[PDB]
Amino acid sequence: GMTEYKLVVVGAGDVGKSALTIQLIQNHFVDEYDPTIEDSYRKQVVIDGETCLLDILDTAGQEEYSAMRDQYMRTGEGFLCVFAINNTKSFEDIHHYREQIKRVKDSEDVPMVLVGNKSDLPSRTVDTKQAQDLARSYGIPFIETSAKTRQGVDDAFYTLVREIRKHK
Ligand SMILES: C[C@H](Oc1ccnc(-c2noc([C@@]3(C)CCCc4sc(N)c(C#N)c43)n2)n1)[C@@H]1CCC[N@H+]1C
Ligand SMILES: Nc1nc2c(ncn2[C@@H]2O[C@H](COP(=O)(O)OP(=O)(O)O)[C@@H](O)[C@H]2O)c(=O)[nH]1
Ligand SMILES: [Mg+2]
């Protein structure tokens, strides 16, 4: 049967989680997507010659640590932790997202990719070296993306699938 991979996109508001997701789903850059909409979106894709079904949860809204929200996030098999390369605060938030993923998955070994989005913009405030070194600290891949140009989009999502495959 066709394997389904449940991927969850997390990170600060405004980093481009929705734009990245929609580039994967629609193959279109959407510069405006209601910042409060949290939803999941499926798409069949070929990854290393194997058709699989991606189910991508694009997170949004208020930080909440209820049992219900933990259970919803626990359905994720792998996580994209997204910051924007022109927003230092979004990068400084990453460790919090990673810690919460480790907690809900009750595992030090959750499939994960660090994503530095908005790589098309000149206003960089987070050095590539610093982001690469954070991914190294965590032992995870780092992918530079742009939802605007499609740079890195498949790399980010497909790497996460490959990481889930390895973990399984
Ligand atoms: C960085 C923070 O801000 C926000 C703002 C919005 N969201 C978060 C946030 N942290 O983890 C999560 C996820 C969605 C990630 C996947 C696993 C779980 S499990 C569960 N229950 C979750 C939730 N809510 C999550 N989201 N954090 C700073 C720092 C602390 C104060 N705060 C202002
Ligand atoms: N230049 C540029 N703008 C982006 C990119 N991704 C998202 N944006 C913009 O960043 C803002 C927030 O994007 P959105 O997808 O809503 O972020 P979310 O809150 O993480 O879902 C919007 O103004 C988008 O147009 C990108 O890669 N490049
Ligand atoms: Mg959004």
Residue numbers in the entry: 0 to 167
Provide excerpts from the study.
Extensive optimization led to BI-2865, a derivative with a prolinol substituent and a pyrimidine linker, which enabled a direct ionic interaction with E62, as well as a water-mediated hydrogen bond network with the side chain of R68 and the main chain carbonyl of Q61. We established high-resolution cocrystal structures (1.0–1.1 Å) of the pan-KRASi (BI-2865) in complex with several KRAS variants. These showed a conserved binding pocket across variants defined by the α2 and α3 helices, the distal portion of the β1 sheet and the distal portion of the Switch II motif in KRAS. A part of the KRASi pocket overlapped with that occupied by covalent G12C inhibitors, such as sotorasib and adagrasib, with the notable difference that the pan-KRASi engaged the pocket without relying on a covalent tether and did not extend in the P-loop channel near the G12 residue. Selectivity for the inactive state is probably conferred by the conformation of the Switch II motif (including residues Q61 and E62), which partly occupies the drug pocket in the active state conformation of KRAS.
KRAS mutations are among the most frequent gain-of-function alterations found in patients with cancer and their therapeutic targeting has long been a key objective in precision oncology.
